[PDB]
Design an enzyme around this catalytic site. Structure first.
Site, mmCIF file in Angstrom:
data_model
loop_
_atom_site.group_PDB
_atom_site.id
_atom_site.type_symbol
_atom_site.label_atom_id
_atom_site.label_comp_id
_atom_site.label_asym_id
_atom_site.label_seq_id
_atom_site.Cartn_x
_atom_site.Cartn_y
_atom_site.Cartn_z
ATOM 1 C CG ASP A 194 4.171 0.137 2.961
ATOM 2 O OD1 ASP A 194 5.284 0.395 3.484
ATOM 3 O OD2 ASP A 194 3.978 -0.774 2.122
ATOM 4 C CB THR A 195 7.028 4.714 5.897
ATOM 5 O OG1 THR A 195 7.681 3.544 6.427
ATOM 6 C CG2 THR A 195 6.099 5.283 6.959
ATOM 7 N N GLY A 196 7.263 2.555 3.268
ATOM 8 C CA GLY A 196 8.148 2.025 2.234
ATOM 9 C C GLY A 196 7.506 2.017 0.864
HETATM 10 C C1 LIG Z 1 5.341 2.512 -6.607
HETATM 11 O O1 LIG Z 1 4.551 2.322 -5.453
HETATM 12 C C2 LIG Z 1 4.848 1.154 -4.827
HETATM 13 C C3 LIG Z 1 4.086 0.842 -3.697
HETATM 14 C C4 LIG Z 1 4.407 -0.309 -2.985
HETATM 15 C C5 LIG Z 1 5.409 -1.169 -3.400
HETATM 16 S S1 LIG Z 1 5.809 -2.578 -2.445
HETATM 17 O O2 LIG Z 1 4.548 -3.108 -1.836
HETATM 18 O O3 LIG Z 1 6.522 -3.543 -3.343
HETATM 19 N N1 LIG Z 1 6.839 -2.199 -1.228
HETATM 20 C C6 LIG Z 1 8.038 -1.499 -1.677
HETATM 21 C C7 LIG Z 1 9.273 -1.910 -0.867
HETATM 22 C C8 LIG Z 1 9.590 -3.404 -1.059
HETATM 23 C C9 LIG Z 1 10.520 -1.139 -1.313
HETATM 24 C C10 LIG Z 1 6.172 -1.716 -0.032
HETATM 25 C C11 LIG Z 1 6.444 -2.638 1.148
HETATM 26 O O4 LIG Z 1 6.178 -2.028 2.405
HETATM 27 C C12 LIG Z 1 5.757 -3.995 1.043
HETATM 28 C C13 LIG Z 1 4.243 -3.931 1.284
HETATM 29 C C14 LIG Z 1 3.629 -5.318 1.119
HETATM 30 C C15 LIG Z 1 3.144 -6.007 2.220
HETATM 31 C C16 LIG Z 1 2.662 -7.290 2.095
HETATM 32 C C17 LIG Z 1 2.524 -7.885 0.842
HETATM 33 C C18 LIG Z 1 3.000 -7.177 -0.255
HETATM 34 C C19 LIG Z 1 3.540 -5.906 -0.128
HETATM 35 N N2 LIG Z 1 6.331 -4.869 2.085
HETATM 36 C C20 LIG Z 1 7.151 -5.891 1.877
HETATM 37 O O5 LIG Z 1 7.561 -6.219 0.760
HETATM 38 O O6 LIG Z 1 7.549 -6.577 2.976
HETATM 39 C C21 LIG Z 1 8.277 -7.779 2.708
HETATM 40 C C22 LIG Z 1 7.363 -8.894 2.204
HETATM 41 C C23 LIG Z 1 6.892 -9.696 3.410
HETATM 42 C C24 LIG Z 1 5.409 -9.502 3.714
HETATM 43 O O7 LIG Z 1 4.830 -10.514 4.567
HETATM 44 C C25 LIG Z 1 5.438 -8.235 4.584
HETATM 45 O O8 LIG Z 1 6.724 -8.154 5.168
HETATM 46 C C26 LIG Z 1 7.615 -9.109 4.610
HETATM 47 C C27 LIG Z 1 8.801 -8.330 4.044
HETATM 48 C C28 LIG Z 1 6.151 -0.878 -4.536
HETATM 49 C C29 LIG Z 1 5.870 0.302 -5.233
#
Ligand SMILES: COc1ccc(S(=O)(=O)N(CC(C)C)C[C@@H](O)[C@H](Cc2ccccc2)NC(=O)O[C@@H]2C[C@@H]3[C@@H](O)CO[C@@H]3C2)cc1
Ligand SMILES: [Cl-]
Ligand SMILES: [Cl-]
Lengths: 99, 99
Positions: free
Chosen positions: A25-27
Site C-alpha cells: 500500500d503506497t498510500g
Molecule cells: C499512519 O499509517 C497509516 C497507514 C494506513 C492508513 S489508511 O489505511 O487509512 N490509508 C491512508 C490513505 C486513506 C491516505 C491507506 C489506504 O491505502 C487505505 C487502505 C485500506 C484498505 C481497505 C480497508 C481499509 C484501509 N485504502 C483506502 O482507504 O481505500 C479507500 C477505502 C475503500 C476500500 O474498499 C479500499 O478502497 C476503497 C477506497 C492511514 C495511516
C-alpha cells in the site's frame, strides 16, 4: 516482480511466526496489521484514514518477510480491516511505482 | 517515472481545470477526492477505510490528468483526509509496483 494493479496487490507475509496476506500500500505511511501478539514493548498511537481514527499498538524493530524479502521496522497492531504493508517497509524491499 | 517511497508519492492532478495534489495509492480500489463540484449526475456509494465506512458521491466518466497522464473514469467525492488516486485510474496510466 512486476505487479499489475488490475486487482489488489496482495502478498503473503510472515510476521510474529505467522503467515498472513497483506496489501502492498503506497498510500500508507506505516504498516498496520490486524490484532495479534508481538514480543517486546509497545506504545499506543492513533492513526487516521477514511472513516476516522483507530487506536493501535506501536511495536518497533519487528522483522517481517514480505513476498520472500526480509525487512525490519515499526509495525502497528490494531483493528484494521485489512493488513497493510506501508511505505516504511516497502522502501526496505526496494519497491517502486512505475509508469 | 520510477517513484521510490521514502516520501509520500504525491503528484499533481488536474480536474475541472483545477490543479490539486493527490496520493498515488495502491491500497485504494477507487479514487477519492475532497469536496468539489463536478458535472453531471452522481450515484451513492459507501466505502470502508481504516476508520470505518463513509458516504461519497460517485461521478462516472470524469476527465482527470494524473502526473501528466490522461485518465477518464470514476471519481468519488467525499470527506477523505487526502486526495487519493486508486487502482481504477492507476491502471489507466499504466502503473505497476516493482521490486
Ligand atoms: C499512519 O499509517 C497509516 C497507514 C494506513 C492508513 S489508511 O489505511 O487509512 N490509508 C491512508 C490513505 C486513506 C491516505 C491507506 C489506504 O491505502 C487505505 C487502505 C485500506 C484498505 C481497505 C480497508 C481499509 C484501509 N485504502 C483506502 O482507504 O481505500 C479507500 C477505502 C475503500 C476500500 O474498499 C479500499 O478502497 C476503497 C477506497 C492511514 C495511516
Ligand atoms: Cl520503520
Ligand atoms: Cl532506493
Amino acid at each position: 516482480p512486476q505487479i499489475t494493479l488490475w486487482k489488489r496487490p496482495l502478498v503473503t507475509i510472515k510476521i510474529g511466526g505467522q503467515l498472513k496476506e497483506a496489501l502492498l500500500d503506497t498510500g500508507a505511511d506505516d504498516t498496520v496489521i490486524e490484532e495479534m501478539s508481538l514480543p517486546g514493548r509497545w506504545k499506543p498511537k492513533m492513526i487516521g484514514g477514511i472513516g476516522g481514527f483507530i487506536k493501535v499498538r506501536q511495536y518497533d524493530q519487528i522483522i517481517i518477510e514480505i513476498a520472500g524479502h526480509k525487512a525490519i521496522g515499526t509495525v502497528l497492531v490494531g483493528p484494521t480491516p485489512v493488513n497493510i504493508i506501508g511505505r516504511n517497509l516497502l522502501t526496505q524491499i526496494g519497491a517502486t511505482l512505475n509508469f
